[PDB]
Design a protein around this ligand. Structure first.
Ligand SMILES: NC(=O)c1ccc[n+]([C@@H]2O[C@H](COP(=O)([O-])OP(=O)(O)OC[C@H]3O[C@@H](n4cnc5c(N)ncnc54)[C@H](O)[C@@H]3O)[C@@H](O)[C@H]2O)c1
Ligand SMILES: NC(=O)c1ccc[n+]([C@@H]2O[C@H](COP(=O)([O-])OP(=O)(O)OC[C@H]3O[C@@H](n4cnc5c(N)ncnc54)[C@H](O)[C@@H]3O)[C@@H](O)[C@H]2O)c1
Ligand SMILES: O=c1ccn([C@@H]2O[C@H](COP(=O)(O)OP(=O)(O)O[C@H]3O[C@H](CO)[C@@H](O)[C@H](O)[C@@H]3O)[C@@H](O)[C@H]2O)c(=O)[nH]1
Ligand SMILES: O=c1ccn([C@@H]2O[C@H](COP(=O)(O)OP(=O)(O)O[C@H]3O[C@H](CO)[C@@H](O)[C@H](O)[C@@H]3O)[C@@H](O)[C@H]2O)c(=O)[nH]1
Ligand code: NA
Ligand code: NA
Ligand code: NA
Ligand code: NA
Ligand code: NA
Ligand code: NA
Lengths: 338, 338
């Protein structure tokens, strides 16, 4: 298939592009490079074994989106582009609503203009809100996310759902990600955050590489087995594969197809730290700090639906996630080159 | 004060502009004329007794909004511009999200750019969703509106709230309207819908003027006193006055000030019909049809908060609403001239 991958040079998108190319699809990447570098391009082509076309541009530019869609005879669009720092979203809400809500709106408006009707959206478990019932199931009603970022994802899901109702021939997948971690097994592609990493895995990796002192563990008084927060970590390669399958199986299948993409099990902060210490060959330094504002104690996905309907399930383990992260971190301590 | 009134040539905005001018404020109207005519301009100035500047343009045009704000040294913005047909929103969701969500976002982004920090937003009781508890109180958590239009209003309220949190010097009023009806007492300004009117009052008026056959009363089996739906109708002049007071009293008062603007009492469809028959001097023809998809049986506002905090309450009655509507309808059967 001919697929436009917005945000294709970013963390999740880069890995997904490699898997798509490996499956022989024709890939066009659209990215504004605000949170990624052109230096990943050659890696995607190498690892993917096929050349992906790259277009530098912004999803907010509807005219350009329309032109790309038409120009490349796109059949389906996988939408990863957006802003995603939770804390920053609190500080700079407008930028989040503009990039995520308006950005997706401009993109789907371009699709309508170009007669493209297959879409895959990067959603998040944040949409479940403060749900006491765990694991989270797609049949649960959504809640109210506590950050502008989380809200922006739920708003997009709603707009997409209304769009599908109005244009019933569309096939739209709402893929709710849990906690993406890991890196391509080659150790040559991975997450390359700029500045202070906000997520657990990269933070741990930077502590391990000797860039950071100690991992601050946000809270040790949670009602969990070891007192630390519990989450569903999913290897980026398993996520990538899930996108390829969703794209291939849902194309031209009208509806709003919602799937949680997670491992279906929870792991604590200590569990993750322990796995990383093992992977890097030295104890990861850490300390206990106060609970992070708004975090829940524990949640993970119920991934039965995707297994049943798409025959998809994760295959990489927690150790692999840690190992692959360390390999990338260690092989490319400065990330992608400028 | 220097106030930019978006959507100022529309139904509610025109009346509000007259009241503002009467209070000696400097008014700049911004409207794209998609649902109004320049012919109302002269009426606003005449009835307002002062000239309001008019700018033809779209709230989606951030650069233009910024320029206007600066150019006119605006102190506060009252935002009425947007799309508001419920049924159409179901059929054309994108247009609604673009005009309402992106439109407001572009406008407030322009405000930030121009250092304007006082805002008044046209919200709706639709934000309460399917709330069994009536009357509706501002302290109730919001619900889930059932149309793209309703959702778009709740999304905007959320974005505005996050914006205020991020820029705490802002003063933002979220004015939740119930059912605006009525017309200026002069009979020379009023609601001028194009095509089939979607709301009860104008529909009744068109039946009365002899344009329409019969009023279809959506449902007669509701658990209400007469079996017809019950709502909170508020005279557009009372609404107008509430906007002037909110603007004057909340300017420079940091926070998110939420107020329901309603009469605080419910009236049935029959009650409204009866009032209109009385006003026009002939029985209004009507019949019973099936319930309208998604309508609730009965709801009205709890307007105590606005009374207490702003010393505002409605003063026009249901008969006045009907009388004023008939006077306008009858004096200007073709509405505003092309
Ligand atoms: N990583 C996670 O923990 C997480 C959790 C849930 C959901 N998501 C979502 O998955 C998607 C991918 O996340 P990621 O971890 O790969 O992040 P990322 O920052 O690595 O990837 C996003 C990419 O989008 C690009 N981009 C940003 N705004 C753009 C715009 N307006 N126009 C064009 N390109 C633009 C960035 O330059 C970057 O390459 C995002 O939508 C994110 O919100 C990620
Ligand atoms: N009338 C009601 O029953 C009702 C109920 C709740 C809330 N509201 C809200 O109150 C506000 C006023 O409603 P109204 O009854 O006066 O409607 P209206 O249609 O008469 O007024 C809206 C005005 O906005 C203008 N406009 C529309 N899109 C625009 C854009 N992108 N840029 C610039 N101008 C634009 C239209 O030309 C029109 O003059 C709207 O936000 C509406 O959603 C009205
Ligand atoms: O320095 C750190 C970072 C994280 N944590 C803890 O580790 C867990 C995972 O934290 P992380 O920030 O990586 O993800 P979250 O589970 O809090 O958030 C998930 O959901 C939000 C949206 O709600 C996304 O933005 C994130 O990328 C992620 O998918 C949590 O228990 C957090 O308290 C620490 O103790 N120290
Ligand atoms: O031809 C008509 C029109 C309306 N009605 C009835 O009259 C009442 C008022 O209907 P209307 O459509 O005017 O307003 P609503 O109360 O249904 O909707 C209110 O809330 C929505 C948002 O949810 C706004 O868009 C509307 O302008 C209005 O403020 C309802 O019981 C409706 O069933 C009829 O019986 N026949
Ligand atoms: Na339709
Ligand atoms: Na960063
Ligand atoms: Na670097
Ligand atoms: Na802040
Ligand atoms: Na109309
Ligand atoms: Na007319």
């Amino acid at each position: 298939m001919r697929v436009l991958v917005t945000g294709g040079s970013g963390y999740i998108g880069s890995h997904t592009c490699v898997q798509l190319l490996q499956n022989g699809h024709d890939v066009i990447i659209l990215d504004n490079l605000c949170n990624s570098k052109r230096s990943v391009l050659p890696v995607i082509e190498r690892l993917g074994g096929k050349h992906p076309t790259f277009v530098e541009g912004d999803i907010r530019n509807e005219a350009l989106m329309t032109e790309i869609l038409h120009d490349h005879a796109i059949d389906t669009v996988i939408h990863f582009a957006g802003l995603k720092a939770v804390g920053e979203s609190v500080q700079k809400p407008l930028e989040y609503y503009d990039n995520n809500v308006n950005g997706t709106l401009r993109l789907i408006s371009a699709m309508r203009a170009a007669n493209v009707k297959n879409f895959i959206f990067s959603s998040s478990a944040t949409v479940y809100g403060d749900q006491p019932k765990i694991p989270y199931v797609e049949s649960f009603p959504t809640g109210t996310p506590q950050s502008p970022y989380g809200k922006s994802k739920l708003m997009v899901e709603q707009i997409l759902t209304d769009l599908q109702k109005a244009q019933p021939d569309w096939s739209i997948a709402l893929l709710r990600y849990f906690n993406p971690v890991g890196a391509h097994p080659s150790g040559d592609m991975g997450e390359d955050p700029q500045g202070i990493p906000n997520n657990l895995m990269p933070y741990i990796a930077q502590v391990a590489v000797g860039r950071r002192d100690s991992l601050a563990i946000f809270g040790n008084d949670y009602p969990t087995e070891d007192g630390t927060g519990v989450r569903d970590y999913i290897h980026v390669m398993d996520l990538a594969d899930g996108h390829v399958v969703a794209m291939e199986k849902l194309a031209n299948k009208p509806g709003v197809h919602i799937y949680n993409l997670g491992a279906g099990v929870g792991n604590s902060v200590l569990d993750v730290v322990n796995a990383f210490s093992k992977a890097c060959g030295k104890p990861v330094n850490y300390h206990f700090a106060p609970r992070r504002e708004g975090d829940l104690p524990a949640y993970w996905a119920d991934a039965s639906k995707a297994d049943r309907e798409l025959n998809w399930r994760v295959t990489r383990t927690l150790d692999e996630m840690a190992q692959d992260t360390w390999h990338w971190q260690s092989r490319h301590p400065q990330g992608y080159p400028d």
